[PDB]
Scaffold this motif. Structure first.
Motif, short mmCIF file in Angstrom:
data_model
loop_
_atom_site.label_atom_id
_atom_site.label_comp_id
_atom_site.label_asym_id
_atom_site.label_seq_id
_atom_site.Cartn_x
_atom_site.Cartn_y
_atom_site.Cartn_z
N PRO A 91 0.82 -1.22 0.00
CA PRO A 91 0.00 0.00 0.00
C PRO A 91 0.85 1.27 0.00
CG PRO A 91 -1.01 -1.64 1.38
CD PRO A 91 0.40 -2.13 1.08
N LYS A 92 0.33 2.34 -0.59
CA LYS A 92 1.05 3.61 -0.62
C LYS A 92 1.21 4.09 0.82
CE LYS A 92 1.01 3.49 -5.04
NZ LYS A 92 2.27 3.21 -5.79
N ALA A 93 0.22 3.77 1.65
CA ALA A 93 0.26 4.14 3.06
C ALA A 93 -0.79 3.36 3.83
CB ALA A 93 0.00 5.65 3.23
N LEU A 121 -4.17 10.69 -4.41
CA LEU A 121 -3.17 9.85 -5.08
C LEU A 121 -3.75 9.13 -6.29
CD1 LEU A 121 -1.56 8.17 -1.94
CD2 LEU A 121 -0.42 9.80 -3.47
N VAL A 175 -5.68 6.59 -6.15
CA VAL A 175 -5.70 5.16 -5.85
C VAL A 175 -6.95 4.83 -5.04
CG1 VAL A 175 -3.21 4.95 -5.86
CG2 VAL A 175 -4.40 5.49 -3.72
N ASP A 220 -2.65 -1.77 -3.55
CA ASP A 220 -1.62 -0.79 -3.83
C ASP A 220 -2.03 0.63 -3.47
OD1 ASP A 220 0.29 -2.66 -4.92
OD2 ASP A 220 -0.91 -2.72 -6.76
N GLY A 221 -3.26 0.79 -2.99
CA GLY A 221 -3.74 2.12 -2.63
C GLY A 221 -3.53 2.50 -1.18
N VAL A 222 -4.56 3.07 -0.57
CA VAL A 222 -4.48 3.47 0.83
C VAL A 222 -5.18 2.41 1.64
CG1 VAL A 222 -5.09 5.19 2.56
CG2 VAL A 222 -4.49 5.93 0.24
N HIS A 255 6.33 -1.80 5.91
CA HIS A 255 5.35 -0.95 5.23
C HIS A 255 5.39 0.49 5.73
CE1 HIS A 255 3.26 -4.08 3.01
NE2 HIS A 255 3.40 -4.85 4.08
N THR A 256 4.75 1.38 4.97
CA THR A 256 4.66 2.78 5.34
C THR A 256 3.40 2.84 6.19
OG1 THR A 256 5.70 3.62 3.32
CG2 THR A 256 4.23 5.13 4.50
N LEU A 273 5.50 11.20 1.63
CA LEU A 273 5.46 9.89 0.99
C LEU A 273 6.56 9.77 -0.06
CD1 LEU A 273 1.67 9.09 0.46
CD2 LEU A 273 3.28 8.07 2.07
#
Ligand SMILES: Nc1ncnc2c1ncn2[C@@H]1O[C@H](COP(=O)(O)OP(=O)(O)O)[C@@H](O)[C@H]1O
Ligand SMILES: [Cl-]
Ligand SMILES: [Cl-]
Ligand SMILES: [Cl-]
Ligand SMILES: [Cl-]
Ligand SMILES: [Cl-]
Ligand SMILES: [Mg+2]
Length: 165
Positions: free
Chosen positions: A2-4, A25, A27, A72-74, A94-95, A165
């Motif tokens: 995930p982006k975050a 984003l 996403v 792959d999103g939030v 992970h972030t 990010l």
């Protein structure tokens, strides 16, 4: 990955910042609680009431691990997911954005009756402060980014995160 991944107490903004951050984003937002209701057709409660913790958490961890790998999103994690060691383990690397909020503001943001199980009507402030003393140390442990949301409007929180990010 995930982006975050957003973590924090009830009302810290996981769903809100998650939705707005994802939109920004371009996403998708995946909320683990929702993925659970959709996976089982059963609401959060029924699962608890019926199966209870151990079984819910086991299902929740199952959903989190899959989301961390396929989404792959939030990703917004249910407030109690971090109490499962398996979840804290899966998060490593992970972030993870920890949305911080004071108890006074947090309890006021949730007064929406939007279904906050662990925050019954009788003395919510006391219950919220207890929840905080219990969950705060866990959020700090898994967090790669701590964001104070106390005096920041949702847009400022989103921009703060996007910048890091
Ligand atoms: N940064 C913020 N400033 C003011 N209000 C906020 C902020 N973040 C969230 N809120 C509000 O608090 C309430 C709880 O937000 P929500 O995203 O559902 O929390 P959570 O998913 O962590 O339980 C919502 O009405 C939301 O609009
Ligand atoms: Cl895994
Ligand atoms: Cl996505
Ligand atoms: Cl929560
Ligand atoms: Cl792992
Ligand atoms: Cl402000
Ligand atoms: Mg939420």
């Amino acid at each position: 990955a995930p982006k975050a991944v957003l973590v924090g107490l009830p009302g810290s903004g996981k769903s809100t910042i998650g939705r707005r951050l994802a939109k920004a984003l371009g996403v998708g937002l995946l909320d683990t609680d929702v993925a659970i209701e959709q996976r089982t057709g059963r609401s959060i409660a029924d699962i608890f009431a019926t199966d209870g913790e151990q079984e819910f958490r086991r299902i929740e961890e199952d959903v989190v691990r899959a989301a961390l790998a396929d989404h792959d999103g939030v990703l917004s994690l249910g407030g109690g997911a971090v109490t499962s060691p398996g979840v804290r383990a899966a998060l490593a690397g992970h972030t993870v954005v920890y949305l911080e909020i004071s108890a006074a503001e947090g309890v006021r943001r949730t007064g929406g009756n939007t279904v906050r199980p662990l925050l019954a009507g009788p003395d919510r402030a006391e219950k919220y402060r207890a929840l905080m003393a219990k969950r705060a140390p866990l959020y700090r442990r898994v967090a790669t980014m701590r964001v104070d949301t106390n005096r920041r409007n949702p847009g400022a929180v989103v921009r703060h995160i996007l910048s890091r990010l």
